[PDB]
Amino acid sequence: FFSSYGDPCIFGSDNTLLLLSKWRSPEESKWLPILDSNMEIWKMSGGKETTDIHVWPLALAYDTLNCILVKGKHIWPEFPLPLPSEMEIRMPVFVKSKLLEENKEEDKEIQIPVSMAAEEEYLRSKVLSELLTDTLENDGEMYGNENEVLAALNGAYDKALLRLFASACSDQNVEKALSLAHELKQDRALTAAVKISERAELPSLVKKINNIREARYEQQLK
Amino acid sequence: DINIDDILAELDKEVSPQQDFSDLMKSWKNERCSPELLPYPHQLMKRLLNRISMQSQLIENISMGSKLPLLCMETELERLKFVIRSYIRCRLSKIDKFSLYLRQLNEDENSLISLTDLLSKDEIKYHDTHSLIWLKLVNDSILKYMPEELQAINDTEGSVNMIDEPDWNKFVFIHVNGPPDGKWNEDPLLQENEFGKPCYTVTIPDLKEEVELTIGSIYVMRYEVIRDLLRDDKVALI
Amino acid sequence: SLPAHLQQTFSPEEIQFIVENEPIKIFPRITTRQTRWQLITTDDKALNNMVAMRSTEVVLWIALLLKQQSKCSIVAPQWLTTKELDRKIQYEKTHPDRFSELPWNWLVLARILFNKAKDDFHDPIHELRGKIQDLREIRQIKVLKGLKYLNESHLQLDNLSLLEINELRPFITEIMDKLREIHTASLT
């Protein structure tokens, strides 16, 4: 089906959701895997193989899948129609064995490293913002407020990057921390990165961030 | 490893009609259970009654101008009026039972609180005139015949005290809220138990004993022991 | 002035009225987003800005008012499912004095939703009606043990529901008051 904003979408026999991005530009058009249902049920079950559960998709509403959760022999629903469910998309980044090791009441959903969570958020924020931006660039707003969602996505993006940056600084990897600092947008975040560098006791990184902030301030003045 | 949750918090951060009804529910529930007559909310009632009048006129104007929004508005106004009706009837019932006590409290020139602080103007009118009606009935019927030593109606000195007053030691159910703003670090009474929630401590003086009132646990407690914390909204009656 | 049966306590009707002010999650079948509701005891924005099949949160009395007609569907609370109720029964059996941590309105809300919203559950309703009963029976055993500690000073209770407290209120308070009178009379 088409998304709630006309993007082409399809659900595979592997039970994965695929979306076509950049279709307006043939040298940039590309297929993106945006959600694996099996990985969600695996986490939801506490890392277990409840193959008795199946997902029946209905439609895509912005970032959320409308679907029926079917149980038993036959992998499709019956009458009278059961009520639908709602589920968010998330990027495929995780590993079962690593998450089991990190994890190690019996069905409790598995706990995840903050690094994976922040990384997945930054990727998801980036993809969502780009798709929304393309929609606005070509077709505009339907309702008059979607720019506010885009602003929220940009805030989430910098926030996720700051956590990853702070991890790199705490590891004293100035090279990786500096490379991450290039990807931050607002000078609020760069100022926070300076404070983070001070807590990490990296005056070299404070210096180089302030060089970047001065360079970007010049670019903002230009 | 380096913490930044506070850096993220400071980076990230850069009266209403809803609230009045919650206060009304609070007042109603506390008034029902407590043994004494609690002080009237003078400001809240003024604002609520004005709002009721305006909403009534709005409903009439829209009616004279889909059905479902009108249904919601009408039944909401019914739900609001019921609470106030119940609350005022309860307060008048308390005034019936403690009339001589309230009059004696007012006559005491050294009293720490005036009767007009405690009661509304309508309640003052009811108390005053009802006392005269009851007084006239017994004065003519019974007391006209008694000798002069026994003609007083509010006698304290007789072999039985003629004035009733609240039972300050009545048992009541309570639920411990803590300070309303979530300012656990600012409340001076709120100490801490070992490896757990904060708590308050109270002394029960007949027994010379102490108890710890943890946040969130329910208790059956004497009224006077918890009166101050109730006045400060640290606890709420169940 | 006030009736005799309302001097010290709340009737079950008032308990239902109190519970009805809580929020609940719904799926609307119509869009209201661009008259307006103009309520005075709640938020007004949520009802004015509904979109069909978009989840939103409203007070329970309006939710039941909508569900009376086709325009709405109610999402069950997450504790009201077979898995969670199984775990709570196991907690009840495991700890023979503590009460399990169910919400303060569990009985009232279950017996409202089973009547007004029997069609919107995912689990089979004839199993939920059994597990609710099992929980109430076990809790009643634990209550009957506790009434041997009525005393002159105080008592502590935890996770006991509002309706369960209100059921017992006139007994506990009366017997406790008389024990207090007997004790203090000997001091004076």
Side-chain angles (χ1 to χ4, degrees), chain B residues 41-52:
Chain B
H42 297 274
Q43 313 309 129
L44 174 61
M45 292 299 304
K46 181 184 291 288
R47 299 190 295 98
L48 277 172
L49 294 165
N50 283 0
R51 196 175 294 129
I52 283 166

PDB file of all heavy atoms in Angstrom, chain B residues 41-52:
ATOM      1  N   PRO B  41     -13.706  26.965  51.712  1.00  0.00           N
ATOM      2  CA  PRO B  41     -12.889  27.571  50.641  1.00  0.00           C
ATOM      3  C   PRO B  41     -13.535  28.804  49.998  1.00  0.00           C
ATOM      4  O   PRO B  41     -14.278  28.698  49.017  1.00  0.00           O
ATOM      5  CB  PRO B  41     -12.716  26.410  49.640  1.00  0.00           C
ATOM      6  CG  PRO B  41     -13.012  25.185  50.419  1.00  0.00           C
ATOM      7  CD  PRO B  41     -14.088  25.589  51.351  1.00  0.00           C
ATOM      8  N   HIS B  42     -13.261  29.983  50.569  1.00  0.00           N
ATOM      9  CA  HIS B  42     -13.933  31.218  50.147  1.00  0.00           C
ATOM     10  C   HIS B  42     -13.687  31.564  48.673  1.00  0.00           C
ATOM     11  O   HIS B  42     -14.620  31.954  47.962  1.00  0.00           O
ATOM     12  CB  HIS B  42     -13.480  32.381  51.038  1.00  0.00           C
ATOM     13  CG  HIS B  42     -13.856  32.228  52.483  1.00  0.00           C
ATOM     14  ND1 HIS B  42     -15.075  32.630  52.991  1.00  0.00           N
ATOM     15  CD2 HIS B  42     -13.159  31.732  53.533  1.00  0.00           C
ATOM     16  CE1 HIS B  42     -15.115  32.380  54.289  1.00  0.00           C
ATOM     17  NE2 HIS B  42     -13.964  31.835  54.643  1.00  0.00           N
ATOM     18  N   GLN B  43     -12.438  31.465  48.200  1.00  0.00           N
ATOM     19  CA  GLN B  43     -12.106  31.935  46.850  1.00  0.00           C
ATOM     20  C   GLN B  43     -12.613  30.968  45.775  1.00  0.00           C
ATOM     21  O   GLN B  43     -13.193  31.384  44.748  1.00  0.00           O
ATOM     22  CB  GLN B  43     -10.586  32.124  46.738  1.00  0.00           C
ATOM     23  CG  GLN B  43      -9.931  32.894  47.898  1.00  0.00           C
ATOM     24  CD  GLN B  43     -10.621  34.208  48.209  1.00  0.00           C
ATOM     25  OE1 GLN B  43     -10.959  34.489  49.360  1.00  0.00           O
ATOM     26  NE2 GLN B  43     -10.828  35.025  47.183  1.00  0.00           N
ATOM     27  N   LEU B  44     -12.380  29.670  46.003  1.00  0.00           N
ATOM     28  CA  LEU B  44     -12.717  28.630  45.036  1.00  0.00           C
ATOM     29  C   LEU B  44     -14.199  28.657  44.689  1.00  0.00           C
ATOM     30  O   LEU B  44     -14.583  28.522  43.520  1.00  0.00           O
ATOM     31  CB  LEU B  44     -12.317  27.266  45.612  1.00  0.00           C
ATOM     32  CG  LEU B  44     -12.686  25.984  44.856  1.00  0.00           C
ATOM     33  CD1 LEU B  44     -12.040  25.962  43.485  1.00  0.00           C
ATOM     34  CD2 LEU B  44     -12.281  24.756  45.660  1.00  0.00           C
ATOM     35  N   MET B  45     -15.046  28.821  45.703  1.00  0.00           N
ATOM     36  CA  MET B  45     -16.486  28.777  45.489  1.00  0.00           C
ATOM     37  C   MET B  45     -16.969  29.958  44.657  1.00  0.00           C
ATOM     38  O   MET B  45     -17.852  29.798  43.802  1.00  0.00           O
ATOM     39  CB  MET B  45     -17.196  28.727  46.839  1.00  0.00           C
ATOM     40  CG  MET B  45     -16.961  27.417  47.598  1.00  0.00           C
ATOM     41  SD  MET B  45     -17.522  25.911  46.776  1.00  0.00           S
ATOM     42  CE  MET B  45     -19.246  26.293  46.486  1.00  0.00           C
ATOM     43  N   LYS B  46     -16.413  31.152  44.901  1.00  0.00           N
ATOM     44  CA  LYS B  46     -16.757  32.319  44.092  1.00  0.00           C
ATOM     45  C   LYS B  46     -16.474  32.042  42.620  1.00  0.00           C
ATOM     46  O   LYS B  46     -17.348  32.218  41.748  1.00  0.00           O
ATOM     47  CB  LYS B  46     -15.963  33.543  44.579  1.00  0.00           C
ATOM     48  CG  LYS B  46     -16.255  34.857  43.812  1.00  0.00           C
ATOM     49  CD  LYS B  46     -15.374  36.036  44.272  1.00  0.00           C
ATOM     50  CE  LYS B  46     -15.700  36.541  45.687  1.00  0.00           C
ATOM     51  NZ  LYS B  46     -17.007  37.276  45.756  1.00  0.00           N
ATOM     52  N   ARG B  47     -15.262  31.551  42.336  1.00  0.00           N
ATOM     53  CA  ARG B  47     -14.883  31.327  40.943  1.00  0.00           C
ATOM     54  C   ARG B  47     -15.736  30.224  40.302  1.00  0.00           C
ATOM     55  O   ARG B  47     -16.199  30.365  39.156  1.00  0.00           O
ATOM     56  CB  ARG B  47     -13.380  31.041  40.870  1.00  0.00           C
ATOM     57  CG  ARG B  47     -12.575  32.244  41.407  1.00  0.00           C
ATOM     58  CD  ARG B  47     -11.070  32.191  41.184  1.00  0.00           C
ATOM     59  NE  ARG B  47     -10.426  31.105  41.918  1.00  0.00           N
ATOM     60  CZ  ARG B  47     -10.094  29.919  41.422  1.00  0.00           C
ATOM     61  NH1 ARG B  47     -10.339  29.591  40.162  1.00  0.00           N
ATOM     62  NH2 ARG B  47      -9.491  29.034  42.213  1.00  0.00           N
ATOM     63  N   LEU B  48     -16.005  29.144  41.046  1.00  0.00           N
ATOM     64  CA  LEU B  48     -16.800  28.041  40.503  1.00  0.00           C
ATOM     65  C   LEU B  48     -18.227  28.476  40.177  1.00  0.00           C
ATOM     66  O   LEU B  48     -18.769  28.120  39.120  1.00  0.00           O
ATOM     67  CB  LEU B  48     -16.821  26.863  41.483  1.00  0.00           C
ATOM     68  CG  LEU B  48     -15.641  25.884  41.478  1.00  0.00           C
ATOM     69  CD1 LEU B  48     -15.762  24.915  42.646  1.00  0.00           C
ATOM     70  CD2 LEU B  48     -15.550  25.105  40.169  1.00  0.00           C
ATOM     71  N   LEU B  49     -18.871  29.213  41.087  1.00  0.00           N
ATOM     72  CA  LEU B  49     -20.263  29.593  40.857  1.00  0.00           C
ATOM     73  C   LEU B  49     -20.386  30.547  39.668  1.00  0.00           C
ATOM     74  O   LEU B  49     -21.322  30.424  38.852  1.00  0.00           O
ATOM     75  CB  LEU B  49     -20.854  30.189  42.140  1.00  0.00           C
ATOM     76  CG  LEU B  49     -20.978  29.188  43.307  1.00  0.00           C
ATOM     77  CD1 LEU B  49     -21.225  29.887  44.641  1.00  0.00           C
ATOM     78  CD2 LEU B  49     -22.080  28.156  43.058  1.00  0.00           C
ATOM     79  N   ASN B  50     -19.432  31.481  39.526  1.00  0.00           N
ATOM     80  CA  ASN B  50     -19.425  32.333  38.336  1.00  0.00           C
ATOM     81  C   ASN B  50     -19.302  31.503  37.058  1.00  0.00           C
ATOM     82  O   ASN B  50     -20.010  31.747  36.061  1.00  0.00           O
ATOM     83  CB  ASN B  50     -18.289  33.353  38.428  1.00  0.00           C
ATOM     84  CG  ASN B  50     -18.608  34.507  39.365  1.00  0.00           C
ATOM     85  OD1 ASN B  50     -19.680  34.563  39.968  1.00  0.00           O
ATOM     86  ND2 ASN B  50     -17.667  35.436  39.495  1.00  0.00           N
ATOM     87  N   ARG B  51     -18.405  30.509  37.071  1.00  0.00           N
ATOM     88  CA  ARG B  51     -18.223  29.674  35.885  1.00  0.00           C
ATOM     89  C   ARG B  51     -19.495  28.900  35.541  1.00  0.00           C
ATOM     90  O   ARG B  51     -19.825  28.730  34.359  1.00  0.00           O
ATOM     91  CB  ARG B  51     -17.048  28.722  36.095  1.00  0.00           C
ATOM     92  CG  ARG B  51     -16.533  28.098  34.808  1.00  0.00           C
ATOM     93  CD  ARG B  51     -15.296  27.245  35.042  1.00  0.00           C
ATOM     94  NE  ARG B  51     -14.149  28.048  35.475  1.00  0.00           N
ATOM     95  CZ  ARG B  51     -13.367  27.824  36.529  1.00  0.00           C
ATOM     96  NH1 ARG B  51     -13.527  26.774  37.324  1.00  0.00           N
ATOM     97  NH2 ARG B  51     -12.379  28.676  36.789  1.00  0.00           N
ATOM     98  N   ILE B  52     -20.211  28.413  36.562  1.00  0.00           N
ATOM     99  CA  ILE B  52     -21.462  27.688  36.321  1.00  0.00           C
ATOM    100  C   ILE B  52     -22.468  28.588  35.610  1.00  0.00           C
ATOM    101  O   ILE B  52     -23.132  28.167  34.649  1.00  0.00           O
ATOM    102  CB  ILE B  52     -22.027  27.126  37.643  1.00  0.00           C
ATOM    103  CG1 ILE B  52     -21.237  25.874  38.043  1.00  0.00           C
ATOM    104  CG2 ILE B  52     -23.547  26.802  37.529  1.00  0.00           C
ATOM    105  CD1 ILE B  52     -21.442  25.402  39.481  1.00  0.00           C
TER     106      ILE B  52
END
